[PDB]
Amino acid sequence: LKGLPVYNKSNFSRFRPSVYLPTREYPSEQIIVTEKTNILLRYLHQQWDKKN
Amino acid sequence: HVLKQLERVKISGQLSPRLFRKLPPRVCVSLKNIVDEDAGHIFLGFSKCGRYVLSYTSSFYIYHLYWWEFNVHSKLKLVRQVRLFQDEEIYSDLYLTVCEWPSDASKVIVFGFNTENHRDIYVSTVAVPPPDPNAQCLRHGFMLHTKYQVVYPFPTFQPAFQLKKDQVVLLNTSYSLVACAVSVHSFCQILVVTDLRGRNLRPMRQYLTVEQLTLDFEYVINEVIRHDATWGHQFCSFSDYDIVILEVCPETNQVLINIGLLPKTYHTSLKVAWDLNTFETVSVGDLTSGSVWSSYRKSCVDMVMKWLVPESSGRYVNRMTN
């Protein structure tokens, strides 16, 4: 028991962060968009597709 | 039990009415003789904001509505007074029913229903007092009395859906369903006899515009039977229909309405979607007298229950019927 794992033995052997204010702008790769169609609407239309 | 709950709030920092709902209402007043003419004034229920106690006169009849201020322990103070259905002669007792929009709290809508084949239904919207008059805020106070009737297969009241959309009220007459939008101030419901009043006088229709959108049921059913029914090529005749609103989405302005249409007519249940934005798309068809109506309505309520999505508390449509 206590055979704990170690990612790297060096860490924790010799024993507050600056605020990051962004000035430059890097364009966003992707945008989250939420589907607005109501859940009944989507389900009934999908079943309509199946029998069509 | 309450004290340790407040202690939990002090530490957790999370306090919601839902977990303060188990506690009984601390204040409970008899309201005996406190309300004027304790008879002359029948209160329905507490308003959504709670600062008002709606009450109407028992009484042709006048049905004077009177809003009352609500204090923790004091006499209630009448703050508003209107006769609701003014341009409406009355010869029956109506079970008054008033509701408010989920978030458009500026005005409330009251529906009076009574006990043959035709039933009298009266609807009117009144602006709640904003918290010569020479006060523009009071000038907002408006009145929109409206009156119609329905055939023996009386449509389901379904008050919440009928008002799910803000600024708009859906009325399902026996032969059409109307989407009245009493907007006071660019345009909505685009991409019925509604006499208006206010301050006991009738102005021309700060300005308020009622955007009315209707579908004639018979026409849309003819369209659907012509274009979207596999057994519609052999359809002979339809006599009567019941329209039930399954659900109203205000985000996309769609209302899902069901029709239980009836060499003989056979029971069906045909689904319809109406885009209030602008335009009728058939969602789902169906397949093959009061009893079948009741069974159909039972099916609709089963569907609504089976797809119930609890609206966020505060975005509900309070129904107020004593």
Add this chain to the structure above:
Amino acid sequence: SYNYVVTAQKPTAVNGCVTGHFTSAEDLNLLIAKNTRLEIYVVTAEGLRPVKEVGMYGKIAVMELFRPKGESKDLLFILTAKYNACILEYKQSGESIDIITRAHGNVQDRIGRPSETGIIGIIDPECRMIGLRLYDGLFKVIPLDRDNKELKAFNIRLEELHVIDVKFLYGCQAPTICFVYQRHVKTYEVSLREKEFNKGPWKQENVEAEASMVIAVPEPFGGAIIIGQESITYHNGDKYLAIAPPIIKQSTIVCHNRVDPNGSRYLLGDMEGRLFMLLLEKEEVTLKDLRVELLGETSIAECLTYLDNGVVFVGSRLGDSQLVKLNVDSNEQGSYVVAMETFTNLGPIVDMCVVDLERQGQGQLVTCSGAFKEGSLRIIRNGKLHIRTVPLYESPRKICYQEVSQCFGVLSSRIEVQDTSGGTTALRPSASTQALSSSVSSSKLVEVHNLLIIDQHTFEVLHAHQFLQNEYALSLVSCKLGKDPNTYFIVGTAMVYPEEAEPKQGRIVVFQYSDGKLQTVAEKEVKGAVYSMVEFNGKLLASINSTVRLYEWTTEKELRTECNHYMALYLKTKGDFILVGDLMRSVLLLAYFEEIARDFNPNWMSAVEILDDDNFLGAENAFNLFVCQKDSTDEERQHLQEVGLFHLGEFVNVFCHGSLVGSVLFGTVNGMIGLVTSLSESWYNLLLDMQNRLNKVIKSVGKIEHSFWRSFHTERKTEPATGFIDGDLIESFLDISRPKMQEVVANLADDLIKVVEELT
């Protein structure tokens, strides 16, 4: 009303903690989450060398570091309590450090009711999709494709409508979820293309009612472990395992961490502070039996995070966060855990009374903090902000200062467990039993409530006063009532009984510290509980339930009531005016009683404060700040118009008048300490234009609009922020470079520098 809010002390409570490789694949990282505060720490040989603390414009409620295939390092997904989700990618190109926001968007649906249990965010172990519990009976799902410019999140109806918590299972060929609904456990597989809840891997099963946590066991073990009181159950189809060790019964398990990558070793944290090592026996690749092992106790844990070299970061919210080291050997007291470094945290600020103990007008803030075993008084003075901590090992309610005897009276509560051996023994030897002198009320007139008088120099408990059994001490204040010049310790208790939900009996007890001995000068029994008290021109103003009665101190050494009024909780007094903050009736005014004006708009205020004679402020339960004025109109004057609105983002518990260096100090459960200061109209206009232009030139991490972040938000209505200046934004202005100052000033340097300098 034109007010300026700035944060004197950044919040220190640990909301969340995730271990991964954000900065660089090779460097292990432990991201710490604090309300609107993201701290990145790289674990090194010396310790956790801090990297960067970027400030989110939202309450970080969901934080997961995930690695999509093809990304060199793990990307970061943050979802603020204002329902803003974002994807962050660390980029230390050369010296420049930039957190590029790969994805940004709101996910609020404004349809379903916020879930009763906290918001819940899962990520598919194969990084296919993101699962997000937002409202009852709904399940927001986000695809993780890289190609599409717009990710199309959608919802699927969860049928249970009351789900405790969900987790994504491991090894399933399709993304299957496993949760517990109010209780049973059910699993529905999820189809991304079809957008529906297909049948899950295994059938639903019944579980103990207290089951409140699912842990996704990784492969090769597979399955999921449901955690509940006397209910340690493992679910994996045919492999249904269960265990009920008596050690679990002591308290509900609240935290879980994967010590072993294979999942053999898992860490458990409970409210009592105990730390249980959960073991999965490795049979040939199946599980034979579950077992748990207690390793000792630690500070109350909000989130555990195992680090390399067998060390763990006990993220805390009710107290002080610790770096506990797990020793393979047992300690002499049978504690496999040894503390090494303890990160300071003000935690829940239940109360605070600014006092200038020294001279030189340097107000020193003494604050009751922590709870349960970690309750402690905090002393913070400007430098930077040196913080001296005096542990009490019991929950403190509120503190009042009596400069006459140079003492600090604090209302303390300690938890004791009933037994048939004697009356009841205490859990731990706290300060209540460690006081120099001890006495009890024992006046005719489980939790043990005591009054601990403490010195203002040595900070050592001088005397304790354990109240009656079931006597719930609620309120305390010190003042010289009436003509009698001896300062008294007037406190309010509640005779709460388990049978009765709402209290019916309570006693206003007058006390006086006689050279080391607390004397009960008077004990007036009051119908109902005494929720809050305050002095009023030499007369005590009590608050019995909804009633608000003033009391007079007669020469006969007794309390006599004056008048009544008609659940009052918050009493602040200025001049003749009494501000009453009810729980649902919001703000009310009084005078000497006659009602003056009430804010009718319902708000669950957490604290109130009278800035000026006409500027009344309070904070509701929506972590938002509003100031209402009294317009001076025969009856419209009885209406309070909310002049200014603001979304602070923290649950302020108390409002104290003063300043460390008008000024109002406020304390939050997260441990934030902030300054509310009034402004002049011209200066307010200049600052608002300042902030508007600064927003344009300063970028926002996660592309979160500052106007939206600070805009008023509650369950009913949302309005833009008015009458309030963010302050912190303006502080950022001085930090930016002079060329960017040239841009922000635009059409209209040193004068703005000076104004922000004095604002500092």
